[PDB]
Amino acid sequence: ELKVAFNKDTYVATVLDASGSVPSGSVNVGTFFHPDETYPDSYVIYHGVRELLYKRSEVDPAQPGFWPENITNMQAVTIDNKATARLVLNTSLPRVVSTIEGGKVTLSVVALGGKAPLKYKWEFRAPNASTWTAVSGQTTANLVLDNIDADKAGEYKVTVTDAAGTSVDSTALVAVGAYPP
Amino acid sequence: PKNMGKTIKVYEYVPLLDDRNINDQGIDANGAHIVNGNLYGSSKDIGTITSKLPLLTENGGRVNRVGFTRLSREGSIHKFGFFYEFTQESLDFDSDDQLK
């Protein structure tokens, strides 16, 4: 939830965090989710601020209005982001990785945003089971399986949670073909 | 191509003599079944070449059979783009007639 507050004169729609503090001269104009649930990408903070400004009034930002008096001129409004960014996973795990026994698969992720302390934790699901076993050790952004065997195949998932609790997730399937035992 | 999607896929085809060619269709030179699908793989050792080397006889039956293996790759396209703005006076009453 991102709380937007808009000012009448400087046309500054400060997009603060949910538990923020509306600055002087600005009035609360609404609240929207940046990581929109049904469409995570393809939507940007700029889109959230617009729809909130499509219900206000040009005469006065409070006392909401509509199309003939709404604030549609997005060119004049300046969006001064003062809130934490998304935990965008720039490079996610490969969807499927193919290897032979004795090989080595180095799974990687790069995270940008959130609060300063980023926590990395990995998880492993058995190749036919349904419960997610917790990978011991790890606690890093790159898992390296060496001399991988036919027992270590399956689905490996990493979950990057920050100091706030906005976790982004990514999964990878590791199919290591081998002669049957 | 449009209307296809946002990700691509291909077919890597491993050669017969490669250690990735992991298959069960394999008959040794004596006509018995063997675990390895290929002939000898990527090995160099001359012993393991002179053995498992496909040798036929005068009456050749199902005494040499090999398998194959197919892999795949993928890659998705991402949208990129930036822009800039200019006013009419910035092009008319400007020193350069080629600023645009």
Contact, A105 vs A69, CB < 8 A?
no
The verdict on B40 touching A (C-beta cutoff 8 Å) is no
Compute CA B62 distance to the chain's CA centroid, rounded to the nearest angstrom.
30
Neighbours of A91 (CB within 10 A): 10
Contact, A145 vs A152, CB < 8 A?
yes
State the best of A78, A92, A100, A173 to mutate against chain B, taking most chain B CBs within 10 Å.
Answer: A100
- Closest residue in chain B to residue A177, using alpha carbons only: B22
Residue A179 with chain B: CB contacts under 8 Å: 22, 35-36
The verdict on A96 touching B (C-beta cutoff 8 Å) is yes
Residue A178 with chain B: CB contacts under 8 Å: 22
Contact, A55 vs A67, CB < 8 A?
no
Distance CA A1, CA A32 (A): 5
Method of determination?
cryo-EM
- At what resolution in Å was this solved? 3.6
The C-alpha angle with vertex B28 and arms to B34 and B18, in degrees rounded to 5, equals 75
Distance CA A40, CA B82 (A): 21
Between the CA of residue A147 and those of A37, A46, A109, B17, B51, what are the distances in Å?
39, 48, 21, 22, 27
> A169-180 burial, b for 16+ CB within 10 Å, e for fewer?
ebebbbebbeee
